[PDB]
């Protein structure tokens, strides 16, 4: 997270950390708990090649990485069939937990938007994670969960900015319709925030608008961050997750 504060100790009860085996269970990707047995995440964190589930764990909300861990095992990984790379689209995935989670005052599920929501500019949206704090700077050894409020852009205004300073012909669509744009040179997601939720407060309720997907570096001029647009994939999500 570039810019932004440390997160209060009760503000995003749905944030998930993904861990990979090694000398220690290292954090590498984010997610959100959307059902007591399902985690929503980015496809490029886990595919396109198949992974051994022995190497993966989920950790639920905690203020500081590693300090008090309770690693949950994963039963199944589901990646959208149309994913190969992030820039092409369908960067979305599901993890099914072995054991269901007790909903508690510390851990609660985020709500998915209705298919009609568009998230026009001016809405209040945040992104949260444990990723790098600047373009080459790791998060320091205490490892707090950070948060930042980002602006939203319309897709066509975002696509136009990506053509500035590029050889790409401006007939060639870069930002597809299953995507969403947010952030600016002072405020962005960064490496290791991938797969994390983007949430907006609509009519008093927090809805997950997007998933951190890709971008041309962190906080660079005319390069907003790209998010997978959750409303585009609701029918695919509800084929596995019990609504």
């Amino acid at each position, epitope marked *: 997270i570039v810019g932004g504060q440390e997160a209060p100790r009760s503000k995003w009860p749905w944030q998930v950390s993904l861990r990979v085996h090694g000398p220690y269970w290292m954090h590498f990707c984010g997610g959100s708990l959307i059902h007591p047995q399902w985690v929503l995440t980015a496809a490029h964190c886990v595919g396109p090649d198949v992974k051994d589930l022995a190497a993966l764990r989920v950790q639920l909300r905690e203020q500081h990485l590693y300090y008090q861990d309770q*690693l949950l*095992p994963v039963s199944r990984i589901i990646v959208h069939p149309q994913f190969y790379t992030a820039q092409i689209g369908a960067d979305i995935a599901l993890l099914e937990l*072995e*054991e269901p989670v007790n909903v508690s005052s510390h851990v609660h599920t985020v709500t998915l938007p209705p298919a009609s929501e568009t998230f026009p500019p001016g809405m209040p949206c945040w992104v949260t994670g444990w990723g790098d704090v600047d373009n080459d700077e790791r998060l320091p050894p205490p490892f707090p969960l950070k948060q930042v409020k980002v602006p939203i852009m319309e897709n066509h205004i975002c696509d136009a900015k990506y053509h500035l300073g590029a050889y790409t012909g401006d007939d060639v669509r870069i930002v597809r319709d299953d995507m969403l744009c947010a952030g600016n040179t002072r405020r962005d997601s960064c490496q290791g925030d991938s797969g994390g939720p983007l949430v907006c407060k609509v009519n008093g309720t927090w809805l997950q608008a997007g998933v951190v997907s890709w971008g041309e570096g962190c906080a660079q001029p005319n390069r907003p961050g790209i998010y997978t647009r959750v409303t585009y994939y609701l029918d695919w999500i509800h084929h596995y997750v019990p609504k």
Partner: antibody
Framework: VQLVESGPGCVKPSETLSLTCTVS????????ITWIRQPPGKGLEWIGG???????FYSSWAKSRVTISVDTSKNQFSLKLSSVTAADTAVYYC????????????????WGQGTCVTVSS | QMTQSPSSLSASVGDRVTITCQSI???????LGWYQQKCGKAPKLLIY???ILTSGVPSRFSGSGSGTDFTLTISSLQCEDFATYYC???????????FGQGTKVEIKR
């Protein structure tokens, strides 16, 4: 990188059997342990286990009498069986599931050398 | 609950053998494994998830199956293949999981 059981070897009836299993390097964080029993001449039967999430699972009969626990301060897993009887005479093993599942038997990759327990007067 | 067959078999060095395991229900999602136990030792995992060979196991062993019926097969008997063999599998999460009765393999020489 290996497990070791420990136990009394000989016990009388109506005591409680205690067993421990210790991991010799690397921590246990992230891993499940299951307890397997082998009566003389029989095959293998499953007692129970504990997941990486610290959830405990027990087979049908064990639920009445068994407790499984973990103590990170000692790098140990422990099995306790109440009210032992002669039919409990078996070799006991601890084994690891690398996925951290608390109740699965298809991928027990790492085993202790076993400990034999005799119930007799 | 499961059955494993045959309960014993006796074959020549060099030869091929097969072992079958069957169930009333179907394994949850490819959750079936094969173990080798030699006299006086703990079981060793050979095959997991129906068909993945464990590292360092010689490619003499192979396994396949279809949710309800599964087979373990050797390409060629060596002397140290003397052992008992067990299937194991799980039919849900958190519940019904069990071993098979085991099979005893004799070398003839």
């Amino acid at each position: 990188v290996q497990l070791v059981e420990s136990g009394p070897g000989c016990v009388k009836p109506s005591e409680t059997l205690s067993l421990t299993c210790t991991v010799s390097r690397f921590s246990l964080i992230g891993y499940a342990i299951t307890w397997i029993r082998q009566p003389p001449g029989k095959g293998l039967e499953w007692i129970g286990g504990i997941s990486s999430a610290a959830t405990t699972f027990y087979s049908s009969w064990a639920k009445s009498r068994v407790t499984i626990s973990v103590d990170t301060s000692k790098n140990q897993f422990s099995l306790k069986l109440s009210s032992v009887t002669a039919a409990d005479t078996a070799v006991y093993y601890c084994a690891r599931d690398p996925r951290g599942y608390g109740a699965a038997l298809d991928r027990l990759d790492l085993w202790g050398q076993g400990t034999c327990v005799t119930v007799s007067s | 609950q499961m059955t494993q067959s045959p309960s014993s078999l006796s074959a020549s060095v060099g030869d091929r053998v097969t072992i079958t395991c069957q169930s009333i229900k179907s394994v949850y999602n490819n959750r079936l494994g094969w173990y080798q136990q030699k006299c006086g030792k703990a079981p060793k995992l050979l095959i997991y998830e129906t068909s993945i060979l464990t590292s360092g196991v010689p490619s003499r062993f192979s396994g396949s199956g279809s949710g309800t019926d599964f087979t373990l097969t050797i390409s060629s008997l060596q002397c140290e293949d003397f052992a008992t063999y067990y299937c194991a599998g799980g039919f849900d999460r958190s519940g019904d999981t069990t071993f098979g009765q085991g099979t005893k393999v004799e070398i003839k020489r």
